[PDB]
């Protein structure tokens, strides 16, 4: 149960982010839905609101400090605090050979799947440390069990993000702040995993990556 | 015997990359010494030529396409081909709390190391695939879990992914994980025909 | 909450097994405490009973099919069913160099940390499959993070047990039966991990090994 | 060049172990062919001696101390020493539901493979430690997650643990993971001085 708790969910307009926002709001948390797409973010918030929830939509490029700080400040100021930060990876776009991935796609993966976690760390972790509680859950991009070709550059930055998440966790391990990760492997099970990890029943877990059925 | 083979060594002017440049030259291989410091690259090249080897030094920001393509085009045009690419792109890093890490400090570890493997793949592996043979060796020099420990995991992961994407192509892609002689030995082994049964493998060795 | 649920906990008289038995009984489960030591098993059951619980002690060599079948039958007949099976690894005994480990210690590790999981599979899994629900949690022996010398033969059979647990899980994955594992790495966090994995809130997890602070 | 070196190859009468026995003999190394079938071991030994090599065949249940100690004592007494031990002890296994696996079927995978590495360590590594040099190579032949997939993980894990427990001893402990030429090549490499910078390493190669 996450009553009186505030969550930011990035990637919130679609995919795993929308399912995660739905689940956390169903558990009683106030949700700031953050997404590149302001309209998609607002639609998800309207849906959560129509269903009994308290939610707000906000546009945000998780690669930009200012966008990520503004979403943290918006959650604190207008929803009244921040206790949970869920960073959603993208939809992995299409599967194609390593040498067909253009620079723009490579760059986007870096921005959305690694740089976002760095800014999340810089923008949300001090608040958590200050209040002596908080949870960050990083949802990796979806890679197959024993993955084959087609996701080489995704699997690369994914391995980096999971290790950064475990590294951040060791630093914050005696702060009350828990930093954990979800590895969707080919939406209910992804959302259930995030909702459990955000709950106080997961208080004994940090620096963990939970493999779940994508 | 890397005689009759051309090798590009990134980060070649010092550290693991200098030691690799020397071992590979000593094995009889032409070597394009690539590094961020043109002066140091030229220095290593002159030493190698002075030791009886063949070598050209070029300034190269591995995070930039033009720089990597230059190093590749030069090796094919001036050194006479390309059969080996060694990617050394890590640096030392004082472990400080992650909230003291500036964006640049972060990009230098995650953005440079990853994109260097990216440009290495876009720029050099088509030449390997065209001739049906070639070896990429990615030394994870980035320097227990720290904020920067993810570069090494990605380098290893990318090595294994690229290797699968080049299965049965005659193109082998391998890694070295230094935890410098033993590093240069593992590179020279992996770059040699004696390692033709090995692709997608990471060799942990004492640094 | 594990009300109206029956758990077998092996290794139950001491160590992580006792902490796990305490936690599961505190959550409402009936506990058959199984242990090599009949008296230690009975003492733990008496403690759980004095605290509000329903518990029974029973001697059992988890390396022997007959001992393991008798504990399953005892739980079904006298506590009224079986839904949870926790296999506790040993205390890792002492840390000593690989070549100082005698054959008797090597043999004991195999029996307690691997053969037990095979019999648990043969003796408890058909019952779970029959009823279409059930959870098995295998608690590995405690190994350090990035472990050094001293636990070579433990770390060997531990790696085997965790892979067997993931293998068993894939087989039973569409049966309602969840097979999961806990890796104590140097007792509350071990017991919390087992209690969560045994609950219906972990229903979306199978074939997972949870690293936790030992 | 394994000339001037003695090697014990377990499971030597067929499969990966025969191919290893031949490659190592061809490298100039005396070879004690150890296997569960004495006749087949003697056959391989005769073939190797007939090819100009030196070899003795012995029946050996690797799960038993006396059998492994015999193979070790014989190699030191009849073949003139011991510098290499290759552990092949896996077998093929039809994947069936785990509830159809009999206790014996389970012991044959988990008990034999693990205890074989145990006796290999108790029986052979003291000789290596005494002379300050030696190489143990553990080929994980036990044959995606299955009930028997844990043998391979243990073999790799034990290899890395033993290697750490023998750091700086001149005694190297390595593994090969066949997913037979490429297996025998990786064994012969790992057993040779060319691999002296490698301990605690598992080489994945196509089987």
Residue numbers in the entry:
A (entry chain A), C (entry chain A): 2 to 187, 221 to 248
B (entry chain B), D (entry chain B): 2 to 144, 151 to 186, 221 to 248
Task: Give the text the authors published on this PDB structure.
One such Rieske oxygenase is found in the organism Comamonas testosteroni, as part of the TsaMBCD pathway, which is involved in metabolizing 4-methylbenzenesulfonate and 4-methylbenzoate into protocatechuate. TsaC, an annotated short-chain dehydrogenase/reductase (SDR) enzyme, and TsaD, an annotated aldehyde dehydrogenase, are the next enzymes in the pathway. These proteins have been suggested to perform iterative NAD+-dependent oxidation reactions on the primary alcohol products of TsaM to produce 4-sulfobenzoate and 1,4-benzenedicarboxylate, respectively. Importantly, TsaC and TsaD also recycle the reducing equivalents used by TsaM and TsaB.
The crystal structure of TsaC was determined to a resolution of 2.18 Å using the structure of meso-2,3-butanediol dehydrogenase (BDH) as a model for molecular replacement. In the solved structure, there are two copies of TsaC in the asymmetric unit, each of which showcases a Rossmann fold and contains a central seven-stranded β-sheet and seven α-helices. Based on an approximate interface of 2837 Å2 (16.2% of the total monomeric surface area), these two subunits form a dimer, and like that observed in BDH, this dimer and two symmetry-related molecules assemble into a tetramer. Similar to the structure of BDH, and as described for other SDR enzymes that are considered classical members of the family, within the Rossmann fold, TsaC contains the expected sequence motifs for binding a nicotinamide coenzyme. However, decorating this binding site, and following β2, is residue Asp36. This residue is positioned similarly to other negatively charged residues in SDR enzymes that are credited with favoring the use of NAD(H). However, in both chains of TsaC, the hydroxyl and amino functional groups of the Tyr155 and Lys159 side chains are located approximately 10 Å apart and do not appear to be catalytically competent. This inactive conformation is a hallmark of other SDR enzymes that, like TsaC, do not have a nicotinamide coenzyme bound in the active site. In agreement with the observed inactive state of the catalytic tetrad, approximately 30 residues between β6 and α7 are too disordered to build and are therefore missing from both monomers in the refined structure of TsaC. The equivalent of the hinge residues in TsaC are Pro185 and Pro221, which bookend the unresolved loop.
